[PDB]
Design a protein around this motif. Structure first.
Motif, PDB file in Angstrom:
ATOM      1  N   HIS A  10     -71.217  72.900 -76.667  1.00 39.42           N
ATOM      2  CA  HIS A  10     -72.607  73.340 -76.566  1.00 39.42           C
ATOM      3  C   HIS A  10     -73.439  73.049 -77.820  1.00 39.42           C
ATOM      4  O   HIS A  10     -72.912  72.646 -78.857  1.00 39.42           O
ATOM      5  CB  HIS A  10     -72.635  74.829 -76.281  1.00 39.42           C
ATOM      6  CG  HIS A  10     -72.169  75.671 -77.427  1.00 39.42           C
ATOM      7  ND1 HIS A  10     -72.260  77.044 -77.423  1.00 39.42           N
ATOM      8  CD2 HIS A  10     -71.630  75.333 -78.622  1.00 39.42           C
ATOM      9  CE1 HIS A  10     -71.804  77.518 -78.568  1.00 39.42           C
ATOM     10  NE2 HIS A  10     -71.414  76.500 -79.312  1.00 39.42           N
TER      11      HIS A  10
ATOM     12  N   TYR B   4     -77.155  71.035 -75.227  1.00 37.94           N
ATOM     13  CA  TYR B   4     -76.354  71.569 -74.129  1.00 37.94           C
ATOM     14  C   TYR B   4     -76.223  73.081 -74.267  1.00 37.94           C
ATOM     15  O   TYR B   4     -75.510  73.572 -75.147  1.00 37.94           O
ATOM     16  CB  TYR B   4     -74.954  70.937 -74.150  1.00 37.94           C
ATOM     17  CG  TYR B   4     -74.947  69.480 -73.771  1.00 37.94           C
ATOM     18  CD1 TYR B   4     -74.581  69.079 -72.482  1.00 37.94           C
ATOM     19  CD2 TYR B   4     -75.294  68.495 -74.702  1.00 37.94           C
ATOM     20  CE1 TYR B   4     -74.554  67.737 -72.130  1.00 37.94           C
ATOM     21  CE2 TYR B   4     -75.276  67.143 -74.360  1.00 37.94           C
ATOM     22  CZ  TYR B   4     -74.902  66.773 -73.073  1.00 37.94           C
ATOM     23  OH  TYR B   4     -74.867  65.444 -72.728  1.00 37.94           O
TER      24      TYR B   4
ATOM     25  N   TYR C 110     -74.530  73.606 -67.399  1.00 45.04           N
ATOM     26  CA  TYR C 110     -75.295  73.390 -68.627  1.00 45.04           C
ATOM     27  C   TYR C 110     -76.768  73.114 -68.380  1.00 45.04           C
ATOM     28  O   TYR C 110     -77.125  72.417 -67.435  1.00 45.04           O
ATOM     29  CB  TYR C 110     -74.796  72.170 -69.418  1.00 45.04           C
ATOM     30  CG  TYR C 110     -73.587  72.356 -70.302  1.00 45.04           C
ATOM     31  CD1 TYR C 110     -72.471  71.538 -70.143  1.00 45.04           C
ATOM     32  CD2 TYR C 110     -73.575  73.301 -71.334  1.00 45.04           C
ATOM     33  CE1 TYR C 110     -71.376  71.648 -70.982  1.00 45.04           C
ATOM     34  CE2 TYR C 110     -72.473  73.421 -72.193  1.00 45.04           C
ATOM     35  CZ  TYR C 110     -71.376  72.581 -71.999  1.00 45.04           C
ATOM     36  OH  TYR C 110     -70.275  72.662 -72.818  1.00 45.04           O
TER      37      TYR C 110
ATOM     38  N   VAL D 201     -79.348  71.040 -69.848  1.00 41.42           N
ATOM     39  CA  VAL D 201     -79.355  69.927 -70.786  1.00 41.42           C
ATOM     40  C   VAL D 201     -80.770  69.461 -71.102  1.00 41.42           C
ATOM     41  O   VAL D 201     -81.471  68.914 -70.250  1.00 41.42           O
ATOM     42  CB  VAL D 201     -78.521  68.748 -70.228  1.00 41.42           C
ATOM     43  CG1 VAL D 201     -78.390  67.631 -71.276  1.00 41.42           C
ATOM     44  CG2 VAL D 201     -77.137  69.259 -69.824  1.00 41.42           C
TER      45      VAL D 201
END
Length: 167
Positions: free
Chosen positions: A24, A52, A60, A62
Motif C-alpha cells: 500500500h 494504493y 485497492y 488506486v
C-alpha cells in the motif's frame, strides 16, 4: 502489425506471500515498459505517481497523480483481488484488464505487470518508494522486460519532476 504480443502468463512471476498492507501507499513510476511504449528522448515522459489505498474488502483504491499544463491531474481505479494474492482485475463482469505484482521488497521497489485484452496492450512498471532506484534494479528491469519480448526502445525511465507528485 508489428505490435509485440502479450506474453503467456506463465512467463510472469508472482510475488509470493504478497502482503497487501505492505504494498500500500505511494509509488513513483521509475521505469515503464510495454508494447505500446516507445522511447523518444526528444520527448521524455515525466514521472508520475500511483497510490494504493487498501479498502476494507481487501480491494485497492488506486490513484494516479500526473503533471500536465501546470496542473495536477488525479484519476482513480479500483483493483479487485484476483485469482491469487498479488493479482488484481480492473473493477462489473460479464460471465479483461489484469494486474500482477511480479516482485517487490515493499519499501524500495515493486515490479508490476499490466495486461488489457480487448484496445489492447501489456506494460510493466518498476515502482520506487522514491524517485530514484539503484542501477542494478533498473538493469534487472530491462532484462525482465526483454525476457517478455520488449526490446529497449519499448522501455522508458520517466524524468523525476517536483510538481504534483510529492502530494
Amino acid at each position: 502489425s508489428d505490435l509485440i504480443p502479450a506474453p503467456p502468463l506463465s512467463k510472469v512471476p508472482l510475488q509470493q506471500n504478497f502482503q497487501d498492507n505492505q504494498f500500500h501507499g505511494k509509488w513513483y513510476v521509475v521505469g515503464l515498459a510495454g508494447n505500446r511504449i516507445l522511447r523518444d528522448d526528444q520527448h521524455p515522459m515525466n514521472m508520475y505517481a500511483t497510490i494504493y489505498e487498501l479498502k476494507e474488502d481487501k480491494s485497492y483504491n488506486v490513484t494516479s497523480v500526473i503533471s500536465s499544463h501546470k496542473k495536477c491531474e488525479y484519476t482513480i481505479a479500483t483493483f479487485v483481488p484476483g485469482s491469487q494474492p498479488g493479482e488484481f482485475t480492473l473493477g462489473i463482469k460479464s460471465y479483461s484488464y489484469l494486474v500482477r505484482v511480479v516482485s517487490t521488497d515493499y519499501n524500495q521497489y515493486a515490479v508490476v505487470f499490466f495486461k488489457l485484452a480487448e484496445a489492447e496492450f501489456f506494460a510493466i512498471t518498476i515502482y520506487g518508494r522514491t524517485k530514484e532506484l539503484a542501477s542494478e534494479l533498473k538493469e534487472n528491469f530491462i532484462r525482465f522486460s526483454k525476457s517478455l519480448g520488449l526490446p529497449e526502445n519499448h522501455i522508458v525511465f520517466p524524468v523525476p519532476i517536483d510538481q504534483c507528485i510529492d502530494g
